[model samples]
Target: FVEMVDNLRGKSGQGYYVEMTVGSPPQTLNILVDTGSSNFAVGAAPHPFLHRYYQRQLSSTYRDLRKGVYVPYTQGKWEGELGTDLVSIPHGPNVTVRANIAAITESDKFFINGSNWEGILGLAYAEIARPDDSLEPFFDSLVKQTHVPNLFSLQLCGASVGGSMIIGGIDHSLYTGSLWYTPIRREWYYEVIIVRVEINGQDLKMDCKEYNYDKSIVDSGTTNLRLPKKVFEAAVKSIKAASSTEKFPDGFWLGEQLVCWQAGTTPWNIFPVISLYLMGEVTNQSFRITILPQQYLRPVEDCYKFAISQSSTGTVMGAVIMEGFYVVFDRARKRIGFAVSACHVHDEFRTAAVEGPFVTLDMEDCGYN
Candidate 1:
């Protein structure tokens, strides 16, 4: 279990991560837990000195794949190359797997100098990988032939305080209330349907539409909620009416993205709780994804940053919108589940979890022992 050790909070901020190793000598790495993009990449040529890099000479099992790698995100991008290594994770299936992966030998438009992370461990679909060197994610590689289950959960928190990510199966205790689910619209993302949006029980009808079938993806890598143009204007208008105050004398804006008031400067009850209604016609049910006051607006330093805004070109819920709920990504069923977060109440290691009985396959024959 990785704690949200967040000295790197704002700007190029990060969430939780997992302790893992790559190469034959088992080079240790703390990879950022990212659901926004796919591929496990480390420092490349230009940025090799920036982070804890995968020193190829030290790892006897490293094999050069001789391919280039380029990753573009909403914030920045990174470029590198491909290589194969024997990899392992703390909560992963009880055996090491040799897999092809991206080894960043050079980079641009990226910075993580002061942080304790080495690279990103992408959790999105394997399809998001570059066409030539399409590789399955580390989690998928480990669970491919095990009883560990194709299920994982995240219990995240606000600010830089941090949270927990449960691999394998559901931890019922981490969240309270019924587990609500919606079918993922596509395999490439944790995509789901948002029928409509509401602020303080009022329907917010905007001109912008979803990418397909009123669908939007759930991403843990992003920090704020994104909506379309007119939709964002409507949301801000509602927030202003509900959260406006005396010291809100000036325009109540937190930075360029967040719409916010100063901490302890206004009546908390007056703030409206925004809701995103997810439609699931397959199950003939609809689930409500609520953005709480804490998740919607957070205190950065002296001021607070409201987390939701206009990316409405298409909809995406980042940590700000997900902090209130325990999110379960069911890859096997192509369904995403949500429950009220028990918050980050506990952080315990499950050393015995991935150590289940063997399948029809043999670990002795495979020489894992």
Candidate 2:
């Protein structure tokens, strides 16, 4: 039977977390769901920003590995000691697994004041695991212990609607339409290929390789849709050219300026639909994933902020894009799948539009050749 868990909660585009219990007595905390990294690290030390932390001495089953772990991210970094403990998601599968746990002593900007989660549960492959790849990730441990398939799916219902993570298999009820499968370019991350980008169905007209640049991955932990710097500038320019026909502050695109209007007003109509074309697995076909303005502009205190940013590293299809589809990380098959999530029934506006097996002339090898 497919293990379907509904304990996930948090605002979409910000982050989503699920309740998990660690240690023998089972010290529970809300763990952030991240697919970009592979370390099940928790705040084991006291910090002013944390509401609570794991007391290492309190867990009778905790075993200190005494190894140092210092992992860094695009935004923050953390230092900790590696250890092992019995960890289980109370709302996930009923099985418990002896798992690698990072007892974080110090961190920067990772955990913030008033944020709901205390730890990060990375679902990526073991290749990116901290300290070394030999350390098993939580999900990998879970699969090993339960004899379940190496597959999982995510449905981020957006903002106030809530979301779910299906372990072991896909929950057909959570999504609609046929799944569009894309080959995984690498095992380190859920990296994929991009053939091109379309704004209001008009191609951005750039070399296809620029879309992938160094790499491009569908990341759940990142909050916004981050594009390659060049692609970002061109996308912004085209958005302005196709949608408004007038000039707006550069700060607006950078999210420094808030574009607000009278109460009960909206600026969504001023923005054009944005779509990404992902290369299909096993064939010369590509699929289109489209997002409306409603998905790109973040609403805060009656104002909307641009939710797309430029990345110096590589493109990241974060929560803004993931919130629109049911994303399947089919690790066993080395591919990812996208289907229209059923959560759109809760939205006041249309959220996701996916099309094609459009046979395209072989574009430059942007991903795995």
Candidate 3:
């Protein structure tokens, strides 16, 4: 379920405020926005393990909501006290939106990384809302109660030329073209359905139904396009045949050489080409996403055989594919759109000419400044 939390708070201090009400009395706390995760959690100070990086901020508005609760992930787990409080989103001094908050102050087994990030405000939907033990998502709860399409748009700016993530709703001004949509599958972990896989002009016939996927979450936070073990192995083999060496172990050695398949030198001149076929469009549109060099995969020997086990499965298509595309996440419409890049159009689509409805948006207006 989804909840309507605050965007940015702490107008008076160094920290930013997130709107989550704890208990009957309204209470808000400072939080950090993280697009990579989909859960809303705060660091509890009195827990069994606390990182030195956690700087405790004493506030009259804060309280311990969850007396004891456990949250776990692949990295580690944390047990904390949970409670609910009233929260307000300060649109102006007089304008405020109320929300339920999770006040936690104890944890265990969770390691806090030493970064500028403090507490995380997960932009994605959460499995359960705290305090009341409601199964509905945080955003969904907020939207249902409010009876309005809760909109949130994150314009993340960075030191680089182009990098940002817009959440909740999209900026209509950000795109000049029509959206290229793909239908989402139910089980792909909210991922977009990829109906076909092609390598070097040959279609690889694999059962699409066999693969588990969440088609709704075509996001930019992930680093690589994660594929299943069988598909990845086949891809590696197909790539290896075109290479000069035949004795290299399982294409791991391909990382060592700067091999390029120039025509006539090798009979297997065609290298692997990848594509994702989204529903709604009958014709295949070749995406101009940046393809990673084979060298990104480290040789198995370097890891002493660990590399093969670690890198064998799961393909992650990261921000590289989203680079030139203006991704539109329409929860209201239950659809997403990809247009040419708003900031750097020419760089993203180098081969294809920028066409009508595919104009560039102001990189500066989208927080380049």
Candidate 4:
């Protein structure tokens, strides 16, 4: 009987990570869990922003792979050397695996100021792995080494309310209601197709294809929900039209500036619930996941930053949107599942939900094949 393990730490804003022991002497590191990419990277050299780093020379069992590695994210990039090391997640499966480790020697904006993680554990498939797909991913290695099921689930509780990542199995207790599933559009990222978007139950009325213009992905590493440029503009316009008061500045909508209101005086009721329609497993069927005002408005020092951003790469349903639900990456089944997360309930805002089996657009191929 395999046990489903809860092994994640950190909040929605800073990024969730798991504690893992690497190398022979078992150097513990907080590795950020990211589904957007497929490279296991750790800080090897010191920088102003980093509090800790992995000294590769200190590991007796470390093997140099003799390959250079460089990975680029939406906001940061890192250069490293590929190597092999024994990695064991104390909260994961029972065995250790010789996983590919990227020793980051140089980086730019990869390690953010005040961040607590020293490494990144990319959970996507090898297709998007830097250098080449031949290098096996850490999760893949774990599955082969331990014979665990090839699946994982995430619960990202927003705003410092702790959450967990269930490795190799689903923790049914973490979610409520039926688990709704949508087919994975691609193997690279946790790519999914969006058929339409709705605000306060009203459709945006744009071409369905616009939702999946580039490639829509569910990325946990990203902090905010990112819509495709066109969809973002339309969303902003629709939101303003639906709202009774236009209290926010253009910079706030652009995600370039934060808007502040008196403590406990922020207007959340004025904002509308945003819904995303995702293509279901069956043809022409879609499921809707909706987020409330409190989910899209982030709390900073004294100001609240808009949690929605415009992206050229496509609609990225990041932690801001995802924290509303318990997301299951069922890789073995080639589908992703969603259900209302238990930790998502709050007195200040209505809990987000998954509703549908609704009819999708008549046009075929919502994704770019």
Candidate 5:
């Protein structure tokens, strides 16, 4: 008898790992799920750093065609065979998603800064085969085919606990509550909307009346929350007072007491709170989306001196603000939602959660693991 394991450790414990089960009689292989880029590729054998993290599944029914498939990304090239495979999640029983398995050729490039990442299951909205075209996002494809909209949530427990991500549907056991939702923006790839930002009980002045249909991507890969230069300066100034120290070698390292500093040892225990307004009418009553304080201002030298640098164009709401809250990307309704607990209780209904999973992925994987 197969017993359900509470936690099965993978390469990256906090995110979804990729794996494949060959055709007919299925066998499973672990893989990583990435939403930032587009491309569903796996590792190649004899990889310098990631060879141990990868397991090659070869069977009579499963063929390893590393000789045939040729898929390339900005980083490097991946070689594998294109074959149908059954992908399953341990959390949700008997639910498996079908995908194309690419047996890796080399695992050397697999290590992102020594991170034990095996391969990436790219889930971008755009198509890898066709860049200009939009195909079914890996998770969206499963939801549509299965017709189970209720099973849509990712429970990234915490880095320490080895968090897990669920696709196609949510694992009700992980959460103790109901789901809160907001409408999706039509333009953005992820379709998230931000209603307002509150710093020390005051709202930053942006032309709410002239609100454009600007798009923002909700990415878990980014470390820092980026905003337009104007927005960043304004929000930063509001949170902490201006710093007298003008020039640091790297950049202007602002004092922690300013309105913009999210967390630090300051006279005021001020936490910068950002609220995201969803489209659902019912959600408005509860103030649908929110962000919590994550960091104290430690600007690297020459971080944001210019008005138009490559990093200044758009705002990034990184994993720091995303902690402790249940975020939902509803492809069916084209909306997103946030909730405090899986249980969905009104008393627990705050825009942001006070506490969250205290987990950090090993950065050593970025350079040497």
Candidate 6:
């Protein structure tokens, strides 16, 4: 009894989105599909400058008294007021759910103010939500009241605006190979403990004792993968052997991580692979998530910005490195599942074709680059 809706790409050109219908007359609102935080909020007015937001005046169901919120972020804090109304996924209306939302009423420069999208539809657990326990996320409310399963999933690929947002279950055809399972560890963020990180074959030696190691949080809202300072330094020394790097003082920024690149000079077809070893709690198994040459940099055509990081524990596995793999954030079983994405499979096929069939992309070529 699952339902589905299209998850569009963010106007920021980094995140993904899904549309939600809010208010009594049912206004269509473009919302970000964020796994990084929990809180459902929208602009009180359409910004008078861009797309649309939750215009309180238009809805008969708009019943908010304006509760202020201050959610802490890695860079700063996301502040807003709380509101509630009838809301549901855009694809279906008969299945509506009254959910909590944050209505931004601050300055004109809120990070997402000028973007084409209006608000965020956070998919993280409710414990992290602002105004804690105020209300359930749209999906959680839907599963409890509607016919859908206790789950939702995201499936996205290259250069596209929207991808599949599945309710109840995942489509078998969206991915290839076996889907490996892992525990959620904690609901704070869709997190995973990268027990080991191997580039090519040798470990990047991401020793937990030395630096911040990395956060290793799986945040789709994040633009690129991040690592601690020392980790990035070693990675640069390793990858830079093939080409010199350039720092973009103004361009490419992934939260706290500084990004650099080699432009079109990067040998995309010959770049190395990075493997993240993960521990599965439910399945009690260990598995590897791989990032290939094409997944190594942004805008493969322009070929710049190798996503780097630091962390209190570790850095994040942002959209930069994650688009290469497939994952299912399962709450019913308190676990998550991952597998090689079709995008990576196709990339491997093409990289092999160019590097000569069966040339061995294994251990030795993995010093750093």
Name the candidate that leads on lDDT: 4
**In terms of lDDT, which candidate is stronger, 1 or 6?**
1
Q: Which stretches of candidate 3 lie over 4 Å from their true place?
A: 1-38, 46-67, 85-112, 126-138, 141-162, 165-168, 172-176, 184-189, 200-202, 210-221, 239-273, 281-320, 344-369
Q: Where is model 6 poorest over a 10-residue stretch in terms of lDDT?
A: 351-360
Estimate, for each residue in 1-369, the C-alpha lDDT of model 5 and write its tens digit.
022222223332134453444344554445555545444555546566563433435443444433355555556666555544455555444566665455566433444654545666655564343223343344554665576563344433332223445554454565444556645444234544444455544667554321112334555544445555555666656543422233233233232221233234332123345554333433233243444332322222212221111133354554444444556656666656555634221222224442221221321111110
Q: How far is 206's C-alpha from truth in model 3 (Å)? A: 2.0
Q: Compute the lDDT for candidate 2.
A: 0.83
Candidate 2 colliding pairs: none
Model 3, 1-369: lDDT tens per residue?
Answer: 122212343211122224333223433434554334344566545333322222224334445443555566565665555443233333312222333333345444343333222355544444333323442334454566565455443322111222333334555555445556543333112345444454544555565432223222443344334455666556556555644344455444333332233344322223333444344423333222223222122122123111111133233433334434555555565544566554433322122112222222221121100
lDDT, model 3: 0.38
Candidate 4, residues 200-223, lDDT tens digits: the string is 899999888888888899999888
Query: In angstroms, how far off is 294's CA in candidate 5?
Result: 4.5
Q: After superposition, how far is residue 224 of candidate 4 from its true place, in Å?
A: 1.0
Candidate 4 CA-lDDT value: 0.85
* lDDT score for residue 230 of model 5: 57
Weakest 10 consecutive residues, lDDT, candidate 2? 344-353
lDDT of each: 0.64, 0.83, 0.38, 0.85, 0.44, 0.62
TM agreement with the true structure for every prediction: 0.81, 0.94, 0.57, 0.95, 0.64, 0.80
Ranking by lDDT: 4, 2, 1, 6, 5, 3
Which 10 successive residues of model 4 have the least lDDT summed? 1-10
Q: Which parts of model 1 have CA positions greater than 4 angstroms off?
A: 1-12, 44-51, 73-75, 91-93, 206-215, 245-266, 281-284, 344-369
TM-score of structure candidate 6: 0.80
